[PDB]
């Protein structure tokens, strides 16, 4: 039967009195403490912590004229995806940003549209071959990929898309 005696004997300094002097009393004390702290961390600490965060964010919103209820529902509607911890951090350290979020929630600004189902282009229904060219849908997808490459971050490849698409011709050897 394992009781973690060798591990718990090192922490008898943190106890006091008879638990610190005598080994069995200190081992029982530390065993009880570790078990109860594990229980609290597993099934009770998160409730208290998230309640504290919720209360802080609710007080921050009440300082601006709203509440946690409306603020949370409207954040969900506007699709901002800010965890209560980040809302608390903004409320405590960036009051201007928190107030801007509250103004966005209170304004009649249209929330972003829902995600769009992937659509198949009209070039997919083209008889290919129509009887050494690429498929029209494949060329459309290559152009979309090149545009998506060039949209993300400034790079030396250039903002032009046609000269970037025609790169195999640059690598080609003219016979």
């Amino acid at each position: 039967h394992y009781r973690a005696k060798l591990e718990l004997d090192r922490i008898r300094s943190m106890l006091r009195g008879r638990a610190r002097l005598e080994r069995k009393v200190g081992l029982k004390r530390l065993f009880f403490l570790m078990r109860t702290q594990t229980r609290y961390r597993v099934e009770q600490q998160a409730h208290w912590e998230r309640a504290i965060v919720r209360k802080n964010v609710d007080s921050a919103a009440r300082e601006h004229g709203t509440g946690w209820q409306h603020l949370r529902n409207e954040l969900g509607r506007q699709n901002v995806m800010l965890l209560p911890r980040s809302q608390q951090l903004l409320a405590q350290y960036e009051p201007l940003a928190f107030r801007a979020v509250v103004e966005l929630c209170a304004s009649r600004i249209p929330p972003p549209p829902p995600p769009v189902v992937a659509s198949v282009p009209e070039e997919s229904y083209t008889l290919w071959p129509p009887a050494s060219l690429s498929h029209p849908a494949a060329r459309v997808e290559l152009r979309c990929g090149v545009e998506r490459v060039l949209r993300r971050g400034p790079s030396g490849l250039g903002n032009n898309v046609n000269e970037l698409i025609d790169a195999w011709k640059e690598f080609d050897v003219s016979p």
Partner: peptide, 9 residues
């Protein structure tokens, strides 16, 4: 067929 990206043919 519309929900996923698959043609009709």
């Amino acid at each position: 067929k519309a929900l996923i990206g698959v043609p009709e043919h």
